[PDB]
Amino acid sequence: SSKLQALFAHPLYNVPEEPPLLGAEDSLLASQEALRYYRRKVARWNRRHKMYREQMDPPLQLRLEASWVQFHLGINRHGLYSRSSPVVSKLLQDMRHFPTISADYSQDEKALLGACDCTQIVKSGVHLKLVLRFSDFGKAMFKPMRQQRDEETPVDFFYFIDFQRHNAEIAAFHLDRILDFRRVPPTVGRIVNVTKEILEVTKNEILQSVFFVSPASNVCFFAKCPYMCKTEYAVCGKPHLLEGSLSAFLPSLNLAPRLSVPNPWIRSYTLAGKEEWEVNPLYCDTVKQIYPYNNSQRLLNVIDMAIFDFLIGNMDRHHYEMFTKFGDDGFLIHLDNARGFGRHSHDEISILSPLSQCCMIKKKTLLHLQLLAQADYRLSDVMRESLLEDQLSPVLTEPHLLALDRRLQTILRTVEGCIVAHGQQSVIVDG
Amino acid sequence: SSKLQALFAHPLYNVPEEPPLLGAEDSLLASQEALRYYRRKVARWNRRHKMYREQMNLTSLDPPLQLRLEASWVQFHLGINRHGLYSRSSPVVSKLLQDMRHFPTISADYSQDEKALLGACDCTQIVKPSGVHLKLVLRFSDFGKAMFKPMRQQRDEETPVDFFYFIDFQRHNAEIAAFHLDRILDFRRVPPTVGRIVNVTKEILEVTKNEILQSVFFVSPASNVCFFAKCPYMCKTEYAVCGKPHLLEGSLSAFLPSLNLAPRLSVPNPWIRSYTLAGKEEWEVNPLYCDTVKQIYPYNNSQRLLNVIDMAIFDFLIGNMDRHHYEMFTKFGDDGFLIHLDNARGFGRHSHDEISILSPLSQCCMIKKKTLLHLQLLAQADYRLSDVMRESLLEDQLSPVLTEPHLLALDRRLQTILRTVEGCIVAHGQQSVIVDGP
Ligand SMILES: *[C@@H]1O[C@H](CO)[C@@H](O[C@@H]2O[C@H](CO)[C@@H](O)[C@H](O)[C@H]2NC(C)=O)[C@H](O)[C@H]1NC(C)=O
Ligand SMILES: *[C@@H]1O[C@H](CO)[C@@H](O[C@@H]2O[C@H](CO)[C@@H](O)[C@H](O)[C@H]2NC(C)=O)[C@H](O)[C@H]1NC(C)=O
Ligand SMILES: *[C@@H]1O[C@H](CO)[C@@H](O[C@@H]2O[C@H](CO)[C@@H](O)[C@H](O)[C@H]2NC(C)=O)[C@H](O)[C@H]1NC(C)=O
Ligand SMILES: *[C@@H]1O[C@H](CO)[C@@H](O)[C@H](O)[C@H]1NC(C)=O
């Protein structure tokens, strides 16, 4: 049969989560306050669109049944979305097929225009990404596939280039759903007509002016400051179609503010020989006494994030984000996973340092990992099966999929080492 | 006597550098092209100053400003050449250090990279590492500009999002000490930097024309003068510094030439991260990575890799794990020297040595003859590195810049560098390790 189907039909993936949601205080957004805010933004956009089109059709209406609207209203204390959620399935399909009505630069990149300084340009930064708006007024971050070879980007160092960038965003969401972490925004691949769906729908004159026709008769747009800095500066359709990743927008920071928190294990340190850094508990013994890691949930949430990052080989989680409303102990949002799935033949166990030093793990997390190590629910099999739904299938080649099984075994062997040293009662925390 | 004096009187610190400078093509700026550009900026600044002083109703007292060629910062810019930012035993640098330390200010503003983050507050672009928020760019009476980084004052209880062991407590001391070590090592690759106790009321608030910077000044409940950053405050990170009640200590770093006159490139550091190799070969000892980097442009040419190895030695000595990128001048091409900017993350742990920073040296096993000779000399008792550093730092207004543990760690890390070179020589011989210069 189907291992992916077997996984979500398994009793483990149907256990109700504790504590059950108590309605109001457990949801991110207040429905009535958020809906009137979205209705004002829609009226704003229709006002902008009416004046623009007159300078050169019926208006847009905010429909409550839109996928992204239910997505935002579905965000609660237990994660970004629900397990086996039909709303998520519809949102993935909507992002893949709905036409676009507007396109612009990301807000953080409108600043670097520019006034070109290569310091703020060669920072994990995807400078050719764009924000697309769909016909249902939803917004997604479009990260195009890396196309230029490093000979065209003299400043870029080969082994730091995000060649797998768009595949990594897609595969990180599917792994998030399979792990039942439910902490990264829904993400799909899409083959985009850059002429029809970007150039002809944007109101940004700067973005209009950077589009050009390649000498090879392809349609392209470029970034001026990255070109002068000799980094990645252009992507092209062939001649119109360009594949990339689309990541669903979280609610506006006006509705749900977010904090950025530094990852205390982003760096490893060479301890005085020959005690290894990932195995020595002194560092986590100190972090356990430092707010906000003194409470159990926060440290266990970071350990979840390190397991996720180890599985995808992401060494670039310098910071994690949280929603203000859920306070401490709230779940961590796993955003911007474009640096994952870059090295299938190398495992950076220093990423697992929170688990190997603190020697504690969620019971739920360990049970899901133990199940995904069994042949009937093999992580690489259910991942390969899940990624077949995407327009850019297979998204992940076989080496990356098989590396998931190897890194999963390493996580489980690490837990065994903790249990030998401290016993199951100390290691496996309950909720 | 004086060990610092003995060091620069030593024959090693008086060897002419090869190849000798050929004047024009070896200088960064063309004097006549650069001087007329500065004269236009001065005329621009005088136009704004007359017009501004009228909008806020202030009598246009005092005569206008004149671009004087003999200004320290002007000669500094014209002195930049293919061999470094400044000359060895340079009286121009000594004067520039004194001018930054004593000259009054005439204008103050935000840095351009932070004028962008005045939004639209997003904590992602605010809590990034290596970022020094609340820093300001000051303009002096001789029209020169310096980056003022104020001392970190708030404890981590006031910054709940900040992780204790990542806080830049030594931030202003690190910028100062990194320049003094740069001069003592004769790398001459970081901009001149001094400490200064600044009256934030007279020399920042009362000279700025930026209304946003004006509005963020306030009086502390303890009757201190303070200014704050709104977006960092909402992000629960470091957001305010204060005089006590007016005076605030910080670091001042001299501006490089405008990117219009001398464009710069930022290049990623291939050794910014270490990796756990499949057992049981250690990362710092395995040469395969550098064997591959040696085949990757622009590290195939000898000068570039040797310059990176110099930068790793420097970063190891000051314990800076945050050199994600290095900068170069466009005009000097690939073989040009590397600029060692933004050293605020150094000198943070006197009791730990991160040998992974030395990885380029321990993997590639090659070093400049000049670099190795200077290190060997600074390890001798008569020229002891901690002694000449302590002596050099006494010139600064914020003396002592480095406490004794940091100074003694310089000697300990120097021994590790030289003992690392010994390991390379055992494996490959002096001929392979010690490279000579063209
Ligand atoms: C991508 O979109 C462009 C523009 O909508 C399409 O090119 C147009 O094709 C029609 C005929 O089908 C012509 O009348 C237009 O003049 C064309 N415009 C341009 C700018 O060439 C293109 O066919 C689309 N490619 C797809 C859908 O694969
Ligand atoms: C973790 O530490 C924080 C702060 O140190 C605790 O939060 C508050 O701490 C102060 C004193 O440190 C108390 O007066 C408050 O009552 C605490 N807030 C509460 C209890 O909500 C926090 O409680 C610590 N974690 C745990 C599990 O106690
Ligand atoms: C720092 O600058 C302030 C502002 O110029 C100086 O304070 C001024 O001088 C005297 C001292 O209080 C007062 O009569 C003025 O009214 C002050 N002006 C303002 C705006 O407060 C101060 O003396 C300077 N030096 C120190 C050490 O604070
Ligand atoms: C380094 O490699 C580049 C490859 O483009 C070549 O042009 C250059 O001449 C090489 N220089 C040296 C010194 O090997």
Numbering used by the authors:
A (entry chain A): 89 to 144, 150 to 216, 218 to 525
B (entry chain B): 89 to 526
Describing publication, verbatim:
We have previously demonstrated that Fam20A lacks an essential residue for catalysis and is therefore the first pseudokinase identified in the secretory pathway. Fam20A forms a functional complex with Fam20C and allosterically increases Fam20C activity towards secretory substrates, including the enamel matrix proteins, whose phosphorylation is critical for enamel formation.
We determined the crystal structure of human Fam20A at 2.5 Å resolution. Gln258Fam20A, which replaces a Glu essential for the catalytic activity of Fam20C (Glu213ceFam20), resides at the C-terminal end of the Kβ3-Kα3 loop. These two disulfide bonds tether the Kβ1-Kβ2 loop to the Kβ6-Kβ7 loop, imposing a strong restraint on the structural flexibility of this region. In the crystal, Fam20A forms a symmetrical, face-to-face dimer.
